[PDB]
Structure 1
């Protein structure tokens, strides 16, 4: 897998963000995770966490997996990095997202993320509290 450049256009919620990629605005949905909707418990905290991570970064990058790159809603499917740190993993490690939506063929970072979810659950963080 390869990292590619992108720039923030605006935050949306814990697991979606609007980025400019190859010069075109696209909403990205984070691979392999599910944050609560803004309305649900920890929804606001997930949104805040992602918003802060992405806007504070100097360098945003997107990394597509081996399979489909856009979902049925036209959202890009990627791992998103903020100054070299993976947002998807960070959300799971903090107990602000569950590993979810693991489709065969777009699952390269599955067991990195499961390792993070185990450690969040062990610490009883947020969703696991």
Structure 2
């Protein structure tokens, strides 16, 4: 059973990275289980635009750590992000703006859910699957 924690938006960076204030400290978060294209690659600006709009227009932003590692080798926080109850990780995957990726042992609680969303976008030929 994972628990959602409060956080405040500092700055949207790109499709799967955002700078948030967590427990009073500035911290860069990398979204769990996803991989959006870099700004330079195809659909990159769209992914960044999608995330940016989604978090900037949210009234409440929550983070949810998984069971395994909470920080990556680059010092980034690893979590599931929620914009007014809606999981940003899943939304990106549902729109075909992100691919399910970097599935490590112990940090894959929401894996099936995201795989489900991917299969839908894949069948609908959304963005990346066009």
Give the shorter-chain TM-score range.
over 0.9
Query: Residue 122 of structure 1: CA displacement?
Result: 0.6
What's the TM-score once normalised by structure 2's chain length? 0.99
Query: Residue 44 of structure 1: CA displacement?
Result: 0.3
Query: Residue 72 of structure 1: CA displacement?
Result: 0.3
Query: Residue 77 of structure 1: CA displacement?
Result: 0.1
Query: Residue 118 of structure 1: CA displacement?
Result: 0.2
Q: 1:88-129: CA deviations, max 9, x gaps?
A: 000000000000000010000000000000000010000000
Query: Residue 30 of structure 1: CA displacement?
Result: 0.2
Query: Residue 53 of structure 1: CA displacement?
Result: 0.4
Cα distance in 2 for residues equivalent to 1:74 and 1:97:
22
Cα distance in 1 for residues equivalent to 2:68 and 2:19:
21
Cα distance in 2 for residues equivalent to 1:102 and 1:78:
13
Cα distance in 1 for residues equivalent to 2:105 and 2:129:
26
What's the TM-score once normalised by structure 1's chain length? 1.00
Consecutive unaligned residues of structure 1, counting only runs of 5 or more, are none
Cα distance in 2 for residues equivalent to 1:91 and 1:104:
22
Aligned pairs, number: 129
Q: 1:20-60: CA deviations, max 9, x gaps?
A: 00000000000000000000000000000000000100000
Consecutive unaligned residues of structure 2, counting only runs of 5 or more, are none
Structure 1 stretches of 4+ with a deviation exceeding 4 A read none
Q: CA RMSD in A?
A: 0.3
Alignment match, 1:109: 110
Cα distance in 2 for residues equivalent to 1:106 and 1:54:
23
